[PDB]
Amino acid sequence: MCGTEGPNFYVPFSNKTGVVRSPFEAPQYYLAEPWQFSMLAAYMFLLIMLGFPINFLTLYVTVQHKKLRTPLNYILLNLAVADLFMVFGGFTTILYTSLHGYFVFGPTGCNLEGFFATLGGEIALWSLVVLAIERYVVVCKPMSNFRFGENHAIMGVAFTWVMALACAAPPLVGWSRYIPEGMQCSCGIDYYTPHEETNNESFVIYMFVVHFIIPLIVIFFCYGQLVFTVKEAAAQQQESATTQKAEKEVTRMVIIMVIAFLICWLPYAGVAFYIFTHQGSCFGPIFMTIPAFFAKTSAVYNPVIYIMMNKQFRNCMVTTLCCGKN
Ligand SMILES: *[C@@H]1O[C@H](CO)[C@@H](O[C@@H]2O[C@H](CO)[C@@H](O[C@@H]3O[C@H](CO[C@@H]4O[C@H](CO)[C@@H](O)[C@H](O)[C@@H]4O)[C@@H](O)[C@H](O[C@H]4O[C@H](CO)[C@@H](O)[C@H](O)[C@@H]4O)[C@@H]3O)[C@H](O)[C@H]2NC(C)=O)[C@H](O)[C@H]1NC(C)=O
Ligand SMILES: *C/C=C(C)/C=C/C=C(C)/C=C/C1=C(C)CCCC1(C)C
Numbered sequence: 367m368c369g370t371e372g373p374n375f376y377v378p379f380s381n382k383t384g385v386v387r388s389p390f391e392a393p394q395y396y397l398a399e400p401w402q403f404s405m406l407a408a409y410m411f412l413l414i415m416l417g418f419p420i421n422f423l424t425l426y427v428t429v430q431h432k433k434l435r436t437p438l439n440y441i442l443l444n445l446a447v448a449d450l451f452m453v454f455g456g457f458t459t460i461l462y463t464s465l466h467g468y469f470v471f472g473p474t475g476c477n478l479e480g481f482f483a484t485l486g487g488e489i490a491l492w493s494l495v496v497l498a499i500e501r502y503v504v505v506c507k508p509m510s511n512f513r514f515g516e517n518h519a520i521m522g523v524a525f526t527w528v529m530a531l532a533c534a535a536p537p538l539v540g541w542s543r544y545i546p547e548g549m550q551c552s553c554g555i556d557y558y559t560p561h562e563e564t565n566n567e568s569f570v571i572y573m574f575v576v577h578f579i580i581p582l583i584v585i586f587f588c589y590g591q592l593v594f595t596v597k598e599a600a601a602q603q604q605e606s607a608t609t610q611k612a613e614k615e616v617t618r619m620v621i622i623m624v625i626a627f628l629i630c631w632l633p634y635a636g637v638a639f640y641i642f643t644h645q646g647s648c649f650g651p652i653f654m655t656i657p658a659f660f661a662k663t664s665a666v667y668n669p670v671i672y673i674m675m676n677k678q679f680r681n682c683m684v685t686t687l688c689c690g691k692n
């Protein structure tokens with residue numbers, strides 16, 4: 367018997383020596399050394415110092431440069447807003463709790479932090495799904511006499527917030543729950559404890575199918591097609607060096623986007639899967655931190671990939687940072 371249970375928590379450490387405490391009430395220095403808690407705090411400090419400016423710039427530069435305010439770009443603004451929910455709801459809270467060594471804000475703060483952080487990563491997740499749908503439509507043109515505009519972009523944004531509420535809301539009201547994870551300083555969905563009163567088993571199956579498998583299939587299909595169309599069109603135009611280079615660029619970027627999506631979400635999905643099919647196994651606190659490390663760090667690498675590497679935004683940002691010149 368692997369940990370210690372409580373009304374709203376599961377500490378991943380045995381209480382045979384009697385030292386375990388509520389992660390809402392006292393430090394967890396028997397799970398991990400104080401310096402490891404400090405390193406958690408350092409890592410959140412890094413993600414704030416990099417994630418805040420990068421995502422805030424994205425919004426600010428868009429306010430200063432008319433060329434960026436196209437409808438295809440609305441979902442990338444949405445991505446930056448989501449990243450900021452993670453920065454201000456998640457990372458700042460965890461910086462604070464890590465340096466106490468436990469979730470000092472108690473079970474209500476655990477629901478708050480877990481909600482805003484989960485909502486953030488989920489809006490981001492679906493933003494990358496919708497962007498792939500939007501680009502597939504625009505390029506592969508699978509419905510004739512259709513022109514992607516403002517209206518559709520608004521719907522895409524609204525859809526991400528609905529899908530994210532469908533993940534983040536139910537654990538506030540009975541289906542799964544928010545409890546402290548890993549080192550017990552951040553809160554997330556209880557995806558690893560069988561907890562029949564809240565129906566954790568069904569919620570994890572729903573999450574895995576609807577919020578991981580569906581996303582992954584939609585992304586592979588949409589970008590799979592997009593690459594096919596672009597490569598077919600370029601083979602029909604080998605006289606153009608331009609078209610050939612654009613085809614190489616599009617293909618490389620699609621590979622990077624798809625790999626980035628897997629890096630971000632496969633660890634949560636794989637760990638959840640392994641735990642679901644190996645219910646007689648202990649999982650320690652550092653191990654349970656790894657999925658979060660991969661997901662949370664996307665609040666930096668997603669805007670680098672989707673925004674910073676796009677040359678329109680990059681010019682405007684330099685201009686904005688250099689007070690109006692270049
Ligand atoms: C992990 O495992 C530990 C050990 O089992 C648990 O910690 C114990 O929790 C219990 C309560 O569930 C604690 O018992 C209470 O002690 C209170 C404090 O006073 C004690 O004073 C004596 C000196 O007289 C000291 O030697 C003790 O160490 C205590 O400090 C006391 O207020 C209280 O008594 C009241 O309730 C009991 C009923 O439970 C009645 O007997 C009594 O009439 C009165 O109403 C308890 O006796 C115990 O002290 C804790 N032990 C330690 C080592 O911390 C953790 O809770 C477990 N963790 C999790 C997360 O579940
Ligand atoms: C800081 C922690 C965050 C932002 C964690 C968010 C976690 C998710 C949205 C994870 C969802 C998943 C499961 C709970 C299991 C099935 C696979 C996922 C990725 C959909």
Ligand SMILES: CCCCCCCCO[C@@H]1O[C@H](CO)[C@@H](O)[C@H](O)[C@H]1O
Nearest residue numbers: 392393394461462463465466467468
């Ligand atoms: C940038 C934000 C800084 C966060 C300030 C963290 C304050 C930590 O608070 C400390 O927590 C200990 C628990 O291990 C307590 O014993 C002490 O009372 C307290 O000094």
Ligand SMILES: CCCCCCCCO[C@@H]1O[C@H](CO)[C@@H](O)[C@H](O)[C@H]1O
Nearest residue numbers: 585586589590593613614617620624
């Ligand atoms: C779901 C997204 C999958 C993208 C499929 C990538 C197709 C790999 O195809 C490769 O693309 C390279 C870049 O032009 C070429 O240099 C290789 O010769 C070509 O086979």
Ligand SMILES: *C(=O)CCCCCCCCCCCCCCC
Nearest residue numbers: 684685686687688689690691692
């Ligand atoms: C508009 O063009 C404004 C550009 C900024 C001009 C000032 C340049 C100062 C560069 C020094 C950066 C060091 C900051 C580190 C502080 C710890």
Ligand SMILES: *C(=O)CCCCCCCCCCCCCCC
Nearest residue numbers: 415684685686687688689690691
């Ligand atoms: C255009 O003319 C303006 C360019 C000036 C930018 C100066 C470069 C600043 C780099 C700062 C990194 C410091 C990290 C620590 C922050 C507290």
